[PDB]
Design an enzyme around this catalytic site. Structure first.
Site, PDB file in Angstrom:
ATOM      1  N   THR A  10      31.474  32.202  40.878  1.00 48.40           N
ATOM      2  CA  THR A  10      31.810  32.321  42.286  1.00 48.40           C
ATOM      3  C   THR A  10      33.317  32.322  42.593  1.00 48.40           C
ATOM      4  OG1 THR A  10      31.440  29.931  42.358  1.00 48.40           O
ATOM      5  CG2 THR A  10      29.651  31.336  43.116  1.00 48.40           C
ATOM      6  N   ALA A  12      37.676  33.078  41.552  1.00 49.37           N
ATOM      7  CA  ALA A  12      38.516  34.248  41.420  1.00 49.37           C
ATOM      8  C   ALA A  12      38.339  34.934  40.059  1.00 49.37           C
ATOM      9  CB  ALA A  12      39.968  33.859  41.601  1.00 49.37           C
ATOM     10  N   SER A  39      27.319  25.742  45.375  1.00 46.73           N
ATOM     11  CA  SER A  39      27.027  27.176  45.360  1.00 46.73           C
ATOM     12  C   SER A  39      25.586  27.500  44.943  1.00 46.73           C
ATOM     13  CB  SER A  39      27.996  27.932  44.444  1.00 46.73           C
ATOM     14  OG  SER A  39      29.319  27.886  44.947  1.00 46.73           O
ATOM     15  N   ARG A  98      41.822  24.811  23.479  1.00 45.53           N
ATOM     16  CA  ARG A  98      42.737  25.798  22.892  1.00 45.53           C
ATOM     17  C   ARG A  98      43.500  25.325  21.668  1.00 45.53           C
ATOM     18  NH1 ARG A  98      45.330  27.733  28.565  1.00 45.53           N
ATOM     19  NH2 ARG A  98      43.518  29.019  29.179  1.00 45.53           N
ATOM     20  N   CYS A 127      46.794  33.160  30.780  1.00 47.61           N
ATOM     21  CA  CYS A 127      47.170  34.489  31.205  1.00 47.61           C
ATOM     22  C   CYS A 127      48.607  34.908  30.859  1.00 47.61           C
ATOM     23  CB  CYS A 127      46.950  34.641  32.725  1.00 47.61           C
ATOM     24  SG  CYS A 127      47.641  33.314  33.720  1.00 47.61           S
ATOM     25  N   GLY A 158      46.229  33.296  40.031  1.00 46.96           N
ATOM     26  CA  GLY A 158      46.144  32.419  38.864  1.00 46.96           C
ATOM     27  C   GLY A 158      45.751  30.989  39.182  1.00 46.96           C
ATOM     28  N   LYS A 222      51.958  25.320  27.394  1.00 49.71           N
ATOM     29  CA  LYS A 222      50.867  26.174  26.942  1.00 49.71           C
ATOM     30  C   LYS A 222      51.451  27.460  26.362  1.00 49.71           C
ATOM     31  CE  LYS A 222      47.507  24.430  30.250  1.00 49.71           C
ATOM     32  NZ  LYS A 222      46.894  24.707  31.570  1.00 49.71           N
ATOM     33  N   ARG A 244      55.946  30.352  40.387  1.00 49.56           N
ATOM     34  CA  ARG A 244      55.027  31.033  41.276  1.00 49.56           C
ATOM     35  C   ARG A 244      55.791  31.791  42.332  1.00 49.56           C
ATOM     36  NH1 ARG A 244      49.879  31.044  39.590  1.00 49.56           N
ATOM     37  NH2 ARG A 244      49.857  28.749  39.540  1.00 49.56           N
ATOM     38  N   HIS A 251      50.918  39.106  37.002  1.00 49.79           N
ATOM     39  CA  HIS A 251      52.063  38.339  36.569  1.00 49.79           C
ATOM     40  C   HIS A 251      53.101  39.244  35.952  1.00 49.79           C
ATOM     41  CE1 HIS A 251      49.732  34.882  37.366  1.00 49.79           C
ATOM     42  NE2 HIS A 251      49.489  34.447  36.144  1.00 49.79           N
TER      43      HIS A 251
HETATM   44  N1  LIG Z   1      43.198  32.453  31.278  1.00 47.02           N
HETATM   45  C1  LIG Z   1      43.819  31.926  32.326  1.00 47.02           C
HETATM   46  O1  LIG Z   1      45.032  31.836  32.337  1.00 47.02           O
HETATM   47  C2  LIG Z   1      43.069  31.436  33.528  1.00 47.02           C
HETATM   48  C3  LIG Z   1      43.460  31.911  34.774  1.00 47.02           C
HETATM   49  C4  LIG Z   1      42.805  31.468  35.900  1.00 47.02           C
HETATM   50  C5  LIG Z   1      41.760  30.557  35.753  1.00 47.02           C
HETATM   51  N2  LIG Z   1      41.384  30.108  34.539  1.00 47.02           N
HETATM   52  C6  LIG Z   1      40.294  29.122  34.440  1.00 47.02           C
HETATM   53  O2  LIG Z   1      39.250  29.386  35.376  1.00 47.02           O
HETATM   54  C7  LIG Z   1      39.050  28.280  36.247  1.00 47.02           C
HETATM   55  C8  LIG Z   1      38.635  28.797  37.604  1.00 47.02           C
HETATM   56  O3  LIG Z   1      39.705  29.631  38.041  1.00 47.02           O
HETATM   57  P1  LIG Z   1      39.571  30.545  39.336  1.00 47.02           P
HETATM   58  O4  LIG Z   1      40.947  31.103  39.618  1.00 47.02           O
HETATM   59  O5  LIG Z   1      38.363  31.393  39.298  1.00 47.02           O
HETATM   60  O6  LIG Z   1      39.325  29.311  40.359  1.00 47.02           O
HETATM   61  P2  LIG Z   1      38.523  29.319  41.768  1.00 47.02           P
HETATM   62  O7  LIG Z   1      38.634  30.662  42.446  1.00 47.02           O
HETATM   63  O8  LIG Z   1      38.956  28.103  42.566  1.00 47.02           O
HETATM   64  O9  LIG Z   1      36.975  29.106  41.357  1.00 47.02           O
HETATM   65  C9  LIG Z   1      36.548  27.909  40.715  1.00 47.02           C
HETATM   66  C10 LIG Z   1      35.185  28.151  40.081  1.00 47.02           C
HETATM   67  O10 LIG Z   1      34.798  27.002  39.314  1.00 47.02           O
HETATM   68  C11 LIG Z   1      33.540  26.529  39.793  1.00 47.02           C
HETATM   69  N3  LIG Z   1      33.405  25.059  39.701  1.00 47.02           N
HETATM   70  C12 LIG Z   1      34.211  24.112  40.218  1.00 47.02           C
HETATM   71  N4  LIG Z   1      33.738  22.876  39.924  1.00 47.02           N
HETATM   72  C13 LIG Z   1      32.606  23.031  39.213  1.00 47.02           C
HETATM   73  C14 LIG Z   1      31.602  22.147  38.586  1.00 47.02           C
HETATM   74  N5  LIG Z   1      31.720  20.804  38.666  1.00 47.02           N
HETATM   75  N6  LIG Z   1      30.570  22.730  37.934  1.00 47.02           N
HETATM   76  C15 LIG Z   1      30.439  24.064  37.846  1.00 47.02           C
HETATM   77  N7  LIG Z   1      31.319  24.925  38.390  1.00 47.02           N
HETATM   78  C16 LIG Z   1      32.393  24.471  39.074  1.00 47.02           C
HETATM   79  C17 LIG Z   1      33.472  26.991  41.234  1.00 47.02           C
HETATM   80  O11 LIG Z   1      32.146  27.044  41.741  1.00 47.02           O
HETATM   81  P3  LIG Z   1      31.844  26.576  43.255  1.00 47.02           P
HETATM   82  O12 LIG Z   1      32.157  27.796  44.095  1.00 47.02           O
HETATM   83  O13 LIG Z   1      30.376  26.213  43.217  1.00 47.02           O
HETATM   84  O14 LIG Z   1      32.775  25.415  43.506  1.00 47.02           O
HETATM   85  C18 LIG Z   1      34.122  28.350  41.146  1.00 47.02           C
HETATM   86  O15 LIG Z   1      33.190  29.339  40.710  1.00 47.02           O
HETATM   87  C19 LIG Z   1      40.377  27.544  36.254  1.00 47.02           C
HETATM   88  O16 LIG Z   1      40.241  26.170  36.656  1.00 47.02           O
HETATM   89  C20 LIG Z   1      40.875  27.778  34.832  1.00 47.02           C
HETATM   90  O17 LIG Z   1      40.451  26.745  33.938  1.00 47.02           O
HETATM   91  C21 LIG Z   1      42.031  30.517  33.439  1.00 47.02           C
HETATM   92  O1  LIG Z   2      42.035  23.800  34.461  1.00 53.65           O
HETATM   93  C1  LIG Z   2      42.622  24.498  35.338  1.00 53.65           C
HETATM   94  O2  LIG Z   2      42.390  24.227  36.540  1.00 53.65           O
HETATM   95  C2  LIG Z   2      43.402  25.645  35.011  1.00 53.65           C
HETATM   96  C3  LIG Z   2      43.826  26.483  36.062  1.00 53.65           C
HETATM   97  C4  LIG Z   2      44.568  27.643  35.818  1.00 53.65           C
HETATM   98  C5  LIG Z   2      44.900  27.983  34.497  1.00 53.65           C
HETATM   99  C6  LIG Z   2      44.499  27.183  33.429  1.00 53.65           C
HETATM  100  C7  LIG Z   2      44.878  27.623  32.143  1.00 53.65           C
HETATM  101  O3  LIG Z   2      45.296  26.836  31.271  1.00 53.65           O
HETATM  102  O4  LIG Z   2      44.835  28.824  31.858  1.00 53.65           O
HETATM  103  C8  LIG Z   2      43.745  26.011  33.681  1.00 53.65           C
HETATM  104  C9  LIG Z   2      43.346  25.212  32.611  1.00 53.65           C
HETATM  105  O5  LIG Z   2      42.316  25.479  32.017  1.00 53.65           O
HETATM  106  O6  LIG Z   2      44.022  24.230  32.234  1.00 53.65           O
END
Ligand SMILES: NC(=O)c1ccc[n+]([C@@H]2O[C@H](COP(=O)([O-])OP(=O)(O)OC[C@H]3O[C@@H](n4cnc5c(N)ncnc54)[C@H](OP(=O)(O)O)[C@@H]3O)[C@@H](O)[C@H]2O)c1
Ligand SMILES: O=C(O)c1cccc(C(=O)O)c1C(=O)O
Ligand SMILES: NC(=O)c1ccc[n+]([C@@H]2O[C@H](COP(=O)([O-])OP(=O)(O)OC[C@H]3O[C@@H](n4cnc5c(N)ncnc54)[C@H](OP(=O)(O)O)[C@@H]3O)[C@@H](O)[C@H]2O)c1
Ligand SMILES: O=C(O)c1cccc(C(=O)O)c1C(=O)O
Ligand code: NA
Ligand code: NA
Ligand code: NA
Lengths: 347, 357
Positions: A10, A12, A39, A98, A127, A158, A222, A244, A251
């Protein structure tokens, strides 16, 4: 084919994971969308099919072949081990696993071989790291890398859906209501997990993630540690400043390297152009260079402004841009999943 | 007191030159505002007084003691030498004369002594250079500088009123009308003088000014060459990447240096705090660091994120922010004028050293 779960469907990244899976070469027999309890019961599309969102639980992964986790490090820490015990192959977008020595940290163009060693979990890097590795690996291969200094120009997506929406609201307040940027109310940026929040509208915030004890942020560290692991070389010196800026997606990075051997610039340009996943966009005579606004929606990483340092014989500067939700997250993850399928590693 | 002329009074920098002069310690008996013929005949305020704008011409400087030029390098090339010939002391806020060996290139806290040798023109450096010099001079004084690598995050106001208006328009088109950023029409940025124009809204443009023949832009090369002159050391290696971002005012910079001797990192912070014009804003435990939006309207230059490189013994990283229209332009220029007054240097020049166009 496979049963595939998207955990964090659900958010980003999850929205782009859905898009990348819809467009994937993975044979998908069944798709499941997992998120939090709040959700659960809502619906999201997979192609023309309505998919009911499920609550993520310790018992939710029965029958799943591949789970793509993008729900925050907390959610992966809690539930990914249960998925692995149930026989699921987990591709984790988060930072949690990681630096675990039993977990491959993979950019498929750079170190796909590392997937062969997986024990049920494969980590996608951050990313900012991923796009830098796509640009620099072709250079490393031919001339080596002694050090990297990088300053990033990171988009707000991000930081999640909330951060996107906060950025848009803030900008409208300034432009439409005449609010001074320094007077804006903020709740998310720079880091949802830190104590103080600052406006991003018309600003540049030199903080991504929280601070570590060495006064670099976790994002900066990281980049340092993930680079060493992906390139399998702890001798590469890497220091980062992660900032940011008011961009929604994609990015950009000002990257400085010193190679081990002098690398002729025209050959560096050719090596980058030749590298899969990297696109050379570099013709300053016609003002051609990578731009965030043009990179959005593309899986490619774009590289230009390539030029020798003015003084350091082995120094090179460049500008690297990629969609942080695609190659920086959802596409790298789906590409990992495709590589696991192609190489017989979904087991 | 003095008769002071502001050349380019009607633009972005000129508005701030007016404010900085209204707030200055110069004894001003008479103000003149100069701009193009289009603006000539119109009126702008100085404090409560209405001032009639004049056309900038070879004959517009009679009776003027000090002229602050901020109307483009071409305008300075053409008219500053005539002002010098009329007996004016010129503070030039353009690039034109910066690398002329008869012209001091001054940031008053760093190299005020260079003013003593002036020949009627004193150049204000580029905004990006100025703030970096305020941050780095205290380090250089104590531990030396071997090299600088800088990546900039530059506000649109640096490119003038038109660029500000273009940025605002583009953002409104996206946010209010639903235009995709890649579908926006641009006319000015990244460089008014270049052939192609690109949107800035939700973008980062790695081009400021036009490209030079070494594939660095003129902005990047200004940082390089101005640093060497201001610090009076051609041995300092400087390479820059200059990037425009969607900020209205205040430039930020990610600055890497290597010093000549190891500089204890907490002493670096202390030296910067102690340096006039630089403010240390550095407490990461409380998320304190310089921010563009907080710097706007201040004459100070703010420095934080100060930390050692992870590998290079003599390497240091930092984040430097200042209002590019104040310390980066109008304030540095007015401060130069105040310093000239204070040091008895506002006097007609004996010999003309500048080409008449
Ligand atoms: N590779 C990268 O650099 C990179 C970049 C961005 C993000 N990420 C990872 O992806 C995560 C989400 O990023 P996003 O940008 O998509 O954030 P976001 O738009 O705020 O979405 C957060 C997602 O996590 C779910 N969630 C939150 N708490 C939860 C729980 N207790 N159990 C199950 N699902 C839960 C949410 O579901 P609900 O809608 O139900 O709350 C939502 O689908 C980050 O925290 C990060 O670890 C990695
Ligand atoms: O845990 C997070 O909320 C988060 C959010 C954005 C990016 C990262 C990441 O390390 O790529 C992360 C992460 O996995 O640490
Ligand atoms: N030190 C720095 O880093 C720095 C930073 C910014 C600017 N500057 C210098 O200041 C200049 C103006 O910048 P800005 O941001 O204020 O630009 P701006 O907002 O576009 O204003 C341009 C000013 O120049 C005047 N002008 C244009 N053509 C002229 C002519 N033929 N004769 C006399 N005046 C003329 C304009 O007068 P009208 O209104 O009558 O057209 C207006 O006052 C730049 O081109 C640059 O040289 C220096
Ligand atoms: O002339 C320009 O177009 C210009 C625009 C912005 C800044 C500067 C500058 O270097 O002060 C300049 C300049 O004087 O070169
Ligand atoms: Na090395
Ligand atoms: Na100080
Ligand atoms: Na005196």
């Amino acid at each position: 084919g496979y049963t595939v779960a998207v955990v964090g469907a659900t958010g980003a990244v999850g929205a782009q994971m859905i898009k990348m899976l819809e467009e994937s070469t993975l044979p998908i027999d069944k798709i499941r969308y997992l998120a939090s309890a709040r959700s659960a019961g809502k619906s999201l599309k997979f192609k023309d099919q309505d998919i009911t969102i499920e609550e993520t639980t310790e018992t939710a992964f029965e029958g799943v072949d591949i789970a793509l986790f993008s729900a925050g490090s907390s959610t992966s820490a809690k539930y990914a081990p249960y998925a692995v015990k149930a026989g699921v192959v987990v591709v984790d977008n988060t930072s949690y696993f990681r630096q675990n020595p039993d977990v491959p940290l993979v950019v498929p163009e750079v170190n796909a071989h590392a997937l062969d060693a997986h024990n049920g979990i494969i980590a996608c890097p951050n990313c900012s790291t991923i796009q830098m590795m796509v640009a620099l690996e072709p250079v490393r291969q031919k001339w080596g890398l002694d050090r990297i200094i990088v300053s990033t120009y990171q988009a707000v997506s991000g930081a999640g859906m909330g951060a996107i929406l906060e950025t848009q609201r803030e900008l409208r307040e300034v432009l439409n209501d005449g609010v001074k940027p320094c007077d804006l109310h903020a709740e998310i940026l720079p880091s949802g997990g830190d104590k103080k929040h600052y406006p991003i509208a018309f600003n540049a915030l030199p903080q991504i993630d929280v601070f570590t004890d060495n006064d670099y942020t976790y994002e900066e560290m990281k980049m340092t540690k993930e680079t060493k692991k992906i390139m399998e070389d702890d001798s590469i010196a890497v220091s980062a400043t992660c900032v940011r800026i008011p961009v929604l997606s994609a990015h950009s990075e000002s990257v400085y390297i010193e190679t081990k051997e002098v690398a002729p610039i025209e050959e560096v340009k050719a090596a980058i152009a030749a590298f899969p996943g990297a696109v050379l966009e570099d013709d300053v005579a016609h003002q051609i260079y990578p731009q965030a606004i043009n990179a959005v929606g593309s899986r490619d990483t774009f590289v230009g402004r390539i030029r020798k340092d003015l003084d350091a014989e082995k120094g090179i500067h460049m500008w690297v841009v990629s969609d942080n939700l695609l190659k920086g997250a959802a596409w790298n993850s789906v590409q990992i999943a495709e590589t696991l399928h192609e190489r017989g590693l979904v087991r």
